[PDB]
Amino acid sequence: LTKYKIVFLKTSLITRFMYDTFDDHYQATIGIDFLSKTMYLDDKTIRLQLWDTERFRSLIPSYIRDSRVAIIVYDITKRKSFEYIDKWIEDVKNEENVILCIVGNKSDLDERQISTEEGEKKAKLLGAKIFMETSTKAGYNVKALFKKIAKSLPENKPGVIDISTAE
Amino acid sequence: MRAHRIDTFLIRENIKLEIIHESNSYFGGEHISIAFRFKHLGSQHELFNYQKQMYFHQPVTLISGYVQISGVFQYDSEVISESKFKDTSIKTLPLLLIPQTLLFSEISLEPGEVRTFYFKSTKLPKDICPSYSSSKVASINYTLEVGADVLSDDNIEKFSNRVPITIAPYISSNAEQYTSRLDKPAIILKTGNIKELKPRXXXXXXXXXXXXXXXXXXXXXXXXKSYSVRDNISNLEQKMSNLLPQLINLQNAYQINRNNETMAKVSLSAPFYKTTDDINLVIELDPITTPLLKVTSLTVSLESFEIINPKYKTEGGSKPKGNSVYEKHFICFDECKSVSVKLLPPRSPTNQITGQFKTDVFQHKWMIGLKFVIIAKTESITLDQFYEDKKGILFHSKENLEGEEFTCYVPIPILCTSEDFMGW
Amino acid sequence: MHLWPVSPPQLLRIPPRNAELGEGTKIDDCNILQSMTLPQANVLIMLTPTRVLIYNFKPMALVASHERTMASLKEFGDNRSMKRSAPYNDIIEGLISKKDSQHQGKLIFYVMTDKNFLLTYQILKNCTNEIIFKEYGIPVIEPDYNNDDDTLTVFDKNSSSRIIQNGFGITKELHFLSENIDELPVKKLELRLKVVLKFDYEIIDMIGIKTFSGRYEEVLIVLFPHGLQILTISDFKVSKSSLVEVKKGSKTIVCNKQLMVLSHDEKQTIVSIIDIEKQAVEAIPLTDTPDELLTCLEVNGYLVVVYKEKIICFDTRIKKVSHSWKPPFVIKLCDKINDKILLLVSEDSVNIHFYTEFGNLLFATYFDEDDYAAEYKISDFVCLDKSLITVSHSGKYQVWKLWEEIKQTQFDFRNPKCYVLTNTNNDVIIYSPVTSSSINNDNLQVIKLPTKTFNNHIAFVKINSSLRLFATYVSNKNILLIHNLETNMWSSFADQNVLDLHWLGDNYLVCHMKNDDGSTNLKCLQIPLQEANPDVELSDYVMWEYNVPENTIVFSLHVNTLSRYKLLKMQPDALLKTAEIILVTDTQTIVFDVISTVHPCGLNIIKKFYQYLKINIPIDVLPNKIEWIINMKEGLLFFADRKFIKLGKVGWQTLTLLDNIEKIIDVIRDEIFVVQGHNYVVYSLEDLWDDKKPLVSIPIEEDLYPISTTPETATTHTLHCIFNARFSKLVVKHQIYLDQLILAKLEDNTDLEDISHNYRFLKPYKFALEKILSTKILRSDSLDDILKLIKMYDNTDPSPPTHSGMLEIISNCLRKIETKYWNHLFTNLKMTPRDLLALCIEENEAKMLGVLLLVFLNYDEXXXXXXXXXXXXXXXXXXXXXXXXXXXXXXXXXXXXXXXXXXXXXXXXX
């Protein structure tokens, strides 16, 4: 099947995507610098590839154009991780449409330094297609997040039977 | 299940033969691979016990063994013309026969010993006539007979058992099937290989040149993979001479109209299906049917049609009858907006509906027969006032109605399957 | 038991009102408040604010209505909700004691209007429960009369003498199943209003039942806000009436042979059990329950109280909340569609959820997925004959056709059990695991019974071991069918009254039969061979027979085929206990050991039956509620209504082992594979008998409810329903719990080198070691055990192996693991990246470098390592993982050069 490519931008979410479901698709082939895993969705087996996740990341701008998706994860406990989303959400467009994804981290960590409604409003303003909230400590929506990502990825006239009743 | 189709036979009281089929059905372009496993039911511990009648645990020697695959086309002369072919009415015709291939020579089996022989037949003809048995006027039957000799008693005893084998027609990458010729003398393949099994910088230069798609590059480098028919069958879902395109007039949705009056719209989940796939249909009838008519009942069915070639038809009148394999009835007295129906034909490793194929003398087709019952749409087609009184107006069912029996057939391709059932 | 949808629902809607509501204006309500079934008469009743509608259920078709006028609407108000005169047919302890009266009586059904009126509608129809069961195959009885009753017969417009649609449809007129039974017509009925009763207080709830005075009468228990009122009506005339004082009552319900009101006070939900002859009420406050009750439910003999947020199972005997569970959504409607599965409707009302009694999700329609009012909001639902009819306030309803799990051979220990579903269209789906092989079986086999009729009630379907025989029974026509699957050959035996069917291992049929001669029942044991030449009768196959005593009543029959056979200890013929038959009777339960001889190939021909014991099972353990029983060593272990109970002598004393067992998946070689509340637990029968800790216990998180298991591969298979308005499909998803099994075994302090040897051959075993190291280093856990376990793997070779397996496992776990844990892992792991590089160079395993190059750079603590790795990969290719790796490396290098080179690498290559 088609080989979807999804750049990520932490590293906890990639770890949680694996080590979660043992549903017969454990054998996730791993390439150089990117991790590929086949995902089950309504009898469909779609190969989702994560392109990348200090000392490096000067090349991931070249990865964005090849990547079908560009995930954004931000820490909800600090504003900087939330405010810096704009630079990268413009950069992805500067570098064909993509299925943009917005998500916070450490939601269940005192918490909620930024209101969830404010995050939703700003994501809608930036044009984000899907917004989900997850957590590193056994996230209850990371599976839902990846399911929504898989769903969002891509995948005549009637024939007139003019024959009349046998007369 | 067992992961393979295994048939077990008892040669003698102390020996068992297991015939293992690597696949349920073998396509026209592939070999026939079958494993014969001979095992001794005795135990080595009892081999030295000391009237005892320990003969059950004695080693047994088989001198000669053989396996042969044959195919026969059976038909009745009442409908098929015998006079132009080159027990009261059934007549047989040999299609193919693999010459008798020796399984082993002078094999000795000790107690508790298993010996496996893998027989691999030569490449079957691309236009092999597929196995066909869900019929009464014509049929094609392939049988594999395996036999050998045992010296259990003073007189050399001989064992020989025949097991049915299923053959499917070759399907190209783009759904092209060969018109299997039937009026031929015979086919004589080779004996077929048998193996007893054993118990237990050119590439660099090529890569350098290539460097000066990723998958394509890898393939090229490994050159210094869709060829199997099963792979083509599986990949068929991911698209859009004697060869004929089986998928030619695909259409997701069909519209049923009688005398230019619409009755219902039939929508298929997929343009084509396989022999082991559930046919999902959505019939929208109330919004589509004309206001003057009400479809009160609708029976859907999956039927197999035999179009006998006019050349090979005896003369002595009517359209072929549809041999139904599944039916589902619906009562639509109320304003039935739509009906979702799931025609699932029988699926089993030892029983699957034969695919769609064409032969020299007859053609096999699969169709969806929908029979409607149409009545005049009155204000209340079902209830008639019976008793009227203050505080209540009783109604009761109409005793008799009137309608017609319009019936139609929607063609639908159903090709052979790649997925193999693990076997009982 | 289980229920899955055959296909997306058939959409219909009720016809508009025939009569004119107003004198000049007409209002077609087309709004369905409630729907309810009357299986005793094969009629489905729908209610609307202005009219009642009565349909013939099985051939779905409207047959009658009432269409009340504006005068009645004003005088009595709009119809509010309808209730049925359900026949309890057992003891209540408050109203009826002798149940011998039972018998078919009047088909009465009441409707409470909007101003406290009871209309007491009556349906008269020339039908009986036995006749309905015979004709339509509806399982109604469990305590052709010409064509005069046929209605809605569609005759052809031309040649009217021929019928084109009598029932489902005429086939325009086989020896196995089958006088015009094929048509399955629609029978006429007469609805009529009988009497109106005036109540001066709001009818919060009501329940009507039938009793015996002597003559038959009806009793209506109606809950007013001030208490309860019991009205006795003989012939629709109000006989003596009794009043009992209950405060703030919410809903009446008859459960476990006792009537109980359910009120709601201080955040408490007092349950008031009522006894009317004694004129007393017993109050049982429940645990913390802030929200108000939504609806009470009686399932499996214990009450189920539903709230807007949670559902609690109240036990009637011990009188204490035994279980609580809340779903992700908030309940709107809740009702049991069968004896086990129940239907929950969320607040949105657009989707339904089949949940099991213990709260594990079975099936769900995930509508409202922003596919876009054209929305179908459910108001009620009725399930009967494997067909769920949901209804909406918009006047439209959906007719669903559902599958149904049917009990199989109860845990033949030799091989895994099969999971089979059956449909009202005489279709069977069979799923069986792969057993020994390491590849999971994803396919479902479809078996079509040999018949064009659609009134066949398949009461029994059993698959023998090796899946070479299929024994099914049609009760409404009393026909046994043996289907050889290997040859696909059917053989039918007519006039059989089998009450129970089991397989005693391969070719043996333990059949609990009913003999018409004197109504006595027997236990026969047939030996159905594959090939029957002369079409023999089922009688001649019998080789053993046991006449049940006349007075004793058999509650159930259980047949277990043992995996290991005990030696009889006396041509010895090696007699062994191959199986065991455990008959359960009200007076005494008999265990028949099946003494047999085992041939080397198999064919366990049985020689005799030995009555092991005649234990008088105490009533305290509810013998009538036993669902499975095994004669373990010197005792019986039986799965009671909700618990596993021991009875093993040592006076005979009982004991409760497990308290919240809802299902037993299957038993495979002394392992039970039970499903406890929200958990799938694998025991060992010896440990369960000794009351030891479970072998393993894994949670059930989602719709992945286990249906079968393959312990050798540590796999559990689950039936998933890919549902959608266009089409519906059934698929199998396999969850591998090998990692959890290894973790549990390690927690048991099991000596290492047995786990590795036990699971070495398993393909996911490597990945099983993964998901444990990664999880353990995450957070903080004792890492030494898993490190040693991984280290010994690949070291116990049959030249040194160089430990390729540990290298690959560690590389995969480390690369997928985040920064801030690499240093911790390298602290626990007595190795360094340089050591790993040296190890692969010694082994020349370029794949380790290919997968660990990213980790090598930006390590925990120029860049010629890339060129070296590329050269190594090239050499390996010369000596398509390597090729792909080399290609990826080259691409990465080219990208880096573009961003920054590759020419140097090319030159070095030459």
Side-chain angles (χ1 to χ4, degrees), chain C residues 694-715:
Chain C
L695 209 151
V696 63
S697 172
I698 55 136
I700 289 157
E701 300 279 29
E702 261 143 24
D703 59 34
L704 316 160
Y705 185 84
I707 75 198
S708 65
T709 169
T710 298
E712 48 257 33
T713 63
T715 297

Side-chain angles (χ1 to χ4, degrees), chain B residues 1 297 334 342 347 350 393 403, chain C residues 66 157 397 433 446 485 728:
Chain B
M1 301 296 208
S297 311
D334 292 331
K342 179 172 192 69
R347 320 196 283 278
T350 68
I393 312 181
Chain C
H66 198 251
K157 221 205 285 289
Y397 53 94
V446 181
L485 290 151
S728 180

Side-chain angles (χ1 to χ4, degrees), chain C residues 819-833:
Chain C
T819 283
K820 203 219 300 190
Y821 305 97
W822 297 7
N823 65 316
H824 177 228
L825 209 168
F826 279 111
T827 313
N828 304 97
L829 164 51
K830 307 173 201 320
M831 213 136 64
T832 77

Side-chain angles (χ1 to χ4, degrees), chain B residues 1 7 297 326-327 331 334 337-338 340 342 347 350-351 380 382-383 393-394 397-398 400-401 403-404, chain C residues 6 11 18 60 62-63 66 152-153 155 157 165 167 191 397 425 427 433 435 445-446 485-486 488 728:
Chain B
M1 301 296 208
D7 292 305
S297 311
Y326 181 88
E327 307 213 331
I331 288 281
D334 292 331
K337 156 164 178 183
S338 91
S340 207
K342 179 172 192 69
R347 320 196 283 278
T350 68
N351 167 35
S380 211
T382 291
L383 287 173
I393 312 181
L394 271 294
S397 44
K398 271 173 169 109
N400 293 333
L401 313 176
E404 296 194 356
Chain C
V6 174
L11 327 178
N18 280 241
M60 191 85 228
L62 177 56
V63 166
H66 198 251
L152 310 176
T153 321
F155 297 82
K157 221 205 285 289
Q165 183 236 319
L191 164 67
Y397 53 94
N425 207 261
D427 230 320
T435 74
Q445 286 72 28
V446 181
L485 290 151
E486 200 89 26
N488 185 1
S728 180

Side-chain angles (χ1 to χ4, degrees), chain C residues 22 120 171 199 207 223 289 415 510 533 567 661 753 775 812 833 891:
Chain C
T120 299
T171 60
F199 287 122
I207 54 181
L223 187 72
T289 42
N415 33 40
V510 178
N533 323 313
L567 261 160
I661 310 313
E753 191 50 47
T775 50
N812 295 38

Side-chain angles (χ1 to χ4, degrees), chain A residues 10-16 18-28 30-35 40-43 52-59 62-63 136 143 151, chain C residues 440 702 704 720 722 729 731-736 738-739 763-764 767-768 770-771 774 778 812-813 815-818 850-851 853-854 857-858 884-885 888-889 895-896 899:
Chain A
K10 298 274 169 267
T11 303
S12 39
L13 273 292
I14 173 54
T15 313
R16 189 62 51 197
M18 263 70 99
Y19 305 139
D20 230 2
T21 80
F22 214 150
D23 295 34
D24 194 36
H25 290 334
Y26 59 89
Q27 179 53 274
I30 299 161
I32 299 114
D33 198 9
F34 77 96
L35 318 96
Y40 212 132
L41 211 69
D42 318 329
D43 249 11
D52 200 333
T53 323
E54 321 315 288
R55 164 61 211 191
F56 254 100
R57 316 318 191 221
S58 49
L59 272 283
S62 313
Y63 289 11
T136 279
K143 181 180 172 176
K151 290 156 154 36
Chain C
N440 316 279
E702 261 143 24
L704 316 160
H720 183 229
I722 293 157
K729 214 171 81 84
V731 305
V732 190
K733 321 297 205 80
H734 333 294
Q735 289 73 226
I736 290 152
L738 211 174
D739 60 294
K763 194 152 290 153
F767 204 109
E770 254 209 287
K771 200 184 308 292
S774 151
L778 291 163
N812 295 38
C813 80
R815 208 189 223 204
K816 299 186 194 180
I817 272 292
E818 321 97 337
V851 70
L853 187 56
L854 178 58
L857 292 96
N858 191 75

